Amino acid sequence: AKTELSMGVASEDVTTLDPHFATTTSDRTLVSYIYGALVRFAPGSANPSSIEADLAESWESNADQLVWTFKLRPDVKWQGGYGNVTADDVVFSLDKARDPKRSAFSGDYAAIQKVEAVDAKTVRITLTRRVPSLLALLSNFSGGFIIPKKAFKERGDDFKRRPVGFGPFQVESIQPGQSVTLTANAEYFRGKPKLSKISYRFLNNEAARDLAFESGELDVEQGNQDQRWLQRLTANPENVVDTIEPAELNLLHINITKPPFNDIRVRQALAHTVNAAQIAKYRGERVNRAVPSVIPSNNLGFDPDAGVLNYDPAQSKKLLAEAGFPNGVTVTMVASQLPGLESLAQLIQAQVAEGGFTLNLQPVEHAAWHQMIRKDLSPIVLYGAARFPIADYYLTQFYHSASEIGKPTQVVNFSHCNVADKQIEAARTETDPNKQIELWKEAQKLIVSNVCAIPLTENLGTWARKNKLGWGFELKGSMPSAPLITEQTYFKD
Numbered sequence: 351a352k353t354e355l356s357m358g359v360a361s362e363d364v365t366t367l368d369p370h371f372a373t374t375t376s377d378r379t380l381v382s383y384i385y386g387a388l389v390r391f392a393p394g395s396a397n398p399s400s401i402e403a404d405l406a407e408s409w410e411s412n413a414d415q416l417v418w419t420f421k422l423r424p425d426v427k428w429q430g431g432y433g434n435v436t437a438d439d440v441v442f443s444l445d446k447a448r449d450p451k452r453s454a455f456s457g458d459y460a461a462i463q464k465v466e467a468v469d470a471k472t473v474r475i476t477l478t479r480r481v482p483s484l485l486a487l488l489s490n491f492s493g494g495f496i497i498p499k500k501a502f503k504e505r506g507d508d509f510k511r512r513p514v515g516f517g518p519f520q521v522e523s524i525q526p527g528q529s530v531t532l533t534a535n536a537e538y539f540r541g542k543p544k545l546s547k548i549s550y551r552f553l554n555n556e557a558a559r560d561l562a563f564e565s566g567e568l569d570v571e572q573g574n575q576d577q578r579w580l581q582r583l584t585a586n587p588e589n590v591v592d593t594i595e596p597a598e599l600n601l602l603h604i605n606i607t608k609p610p611f612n613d614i615r616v617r618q619a620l621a622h623t624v625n626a627a628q629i630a631k632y633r634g635e636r637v638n639r640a641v642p643s644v645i646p647s648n649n650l651g652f653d654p655d656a657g658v659l660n661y662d663p664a665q666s667k668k669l670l671a672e673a674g675f676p677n678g679v680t681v682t683m684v685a686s687q688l689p690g691l692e693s694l695a696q697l698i699q700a701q702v703a704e705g706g707f708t709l710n711l712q713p714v715e716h717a718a719w720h721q722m723i724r725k726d727l728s729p730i731v732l733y734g735a736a737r738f739p740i741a742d743y744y745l746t747q748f749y750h751s752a753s754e755i756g757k758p759t760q761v762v763n764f765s766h767c768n769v770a771d772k773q774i775e776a777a778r779t780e781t782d783p784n785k786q787i788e789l790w791k792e793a794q795k796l797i798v799s800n801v802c803a804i805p806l807t808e809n810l811g812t813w814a815r816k817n818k819l820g821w822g823f824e825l826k827g828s829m830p831s832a833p834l835i836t837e838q839t840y841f842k843d
């Protein structure tokens with residue numbers, strides 16, 4: 351049939367298409383269409399078990415698994431005429447990914463010692479110690495994507511809006527705040543895409559997005575976490591709703607160094623007046639689930655019994671009075687305008703009033719909000735995300751003190767947590783599998799009991815499409831929790 355795909359997303363604009371910085375779901379989704387990596391998750395899977403060849407046609411490790419040699423596919427071409435992808439591009443990209451001055455994801459690569467071009471088609475990666483999940487680090491997510499040395503060196507600060515990858519689609523143009531026009535990479539190494547163009551539309555307003563989808567302007571539209579939207583879409587036999595793994599866990603990360611939240615009783619009071627099970631029941635159990643820990647349930651090392659504080663708003667009021675707040679606590683939070691996070695913050699705002707908290711929400715456009723929270727501008731941060739499914743990733747990034755906002759090594763530790771550093775570090779390199787699991791669980795119990803963060807629900811990604819669109823594979827998951835459009839995506843007659 352037709353070869354042009356139109357999709358409506360919950361975003362206001364592009365922030366960065368440099369894969370070493372792209373963090374919002376929208377920027378990560380675009381990056382997943384433009385770039386590739388040495389290896390990749392199988393299309394339609396978010397599980398590292400599925401990892402398969404991408405730019406690297408084969409690889410091997412030495413006996414001690416400290417030296418890995420990747421053999422590159424010969425004639426993989428960059429978009430825009432930058433020529434053949436070489437080992438020098440891989441060295442440049444991985445060294446950039448592992449540099450805290452040029453990447454938002456450098457901490458994931460701390461165990462890489464060196465990356466060397468043995469020849470134009472051979473890359474040698476030497477590790478400081480064994481890294482069981484190395485292939486996930488080298489895959490098509492976060493810092494694994496490969497970029498062109500020549501394009502980045504020249505474009506510099508403009509590369510983020512004029513990206514160049516070897517993926518199936520290229521950015522032809524950006525219409526700021528309206529859309530991104532992507533076109534098929536005619537030289538894509540797996541074959542020319544069946545789609546000729548993608549019109550990626552910024553439709554943050556849910557009512558306008560739904561109207562564009564029902565009027566036939568969109569072939570795909572991002573949904574939300576509400577079962578009511580899910581039921582209204584599934585009612586039309588022409589629509590298909592995809593619920594996409596991994597589930598992103600939402601937490602209230604509390605800055606434990608800032609009064610009044612430096613008193614554990616105040617944090618405990620907040621935790622006793624949130625009700626994640628009620629949010630999950632309201633939003634719907636197919637897409638949403640309350641999580642009994644501070645990392646997503648789909649993690650090796652997840653603790654189903656971390657000790658999450660129960661709902662008891664009478665106890666919240668008692669604790670606030672003991673802490674010197676007989677008339678309650680008021681707090682202003684900088685809150686994202688991404689509709690799912692905005693509606694979640696509004697649900698929490700209503701819940702916490704029962705226990706004596708009056709939450710004032712200062713709304714900020716999503717990408718601007720991401721910048722503000724990373725400047726330590728909010729006392730509490732409602733953040734929702736998933737990472738590779740090994741506890742070390744979520745724990746290190748959100749809760750290890752090295753990740754604390756304000757440090758050169760900062761990641762997403764908005765709570766300024768430091769209570770679990772020794773357990774996180776010991777678990778990371780523990781070779782006894784059961785002991786490693788127990789150290790990850792001990793870290794979760796400490797973070798929960800000190801109330802550095804309060805878990806809410808985790809939600810699968812929700813997207814609607816017309817049944818005339820075929821992905822070319824089963825869309826079970828995608829690391830950004832969004833559809834993956836590839837050279838296989840097609841329309842039916």
Ligand SMILES: O=C(O)CC[C@@H](NCC(=O)[C@H](O)[C@H](O)[C@@H](O)CO)C(=O)O
Nearest residue numbers: 373374375575598600690691694734735
């Ligand atoms: O990877 C990251 O660090 C950020 C993840 C990215 N995910 C969107 C997100 O927070 C979730 O969809 C979120 O769980 C809300 O919509 C909850 O209703 C973000 O754009 O903020």
Ligand SMILES: [Mg+2]
Nearest residue numbers: 361374376716
């Ligand atoms: Mg955005």
Ligand SMILES: [Mg+2]
Nearest residue numbers: 767768769802
């Ligand atoms: Mg902590």
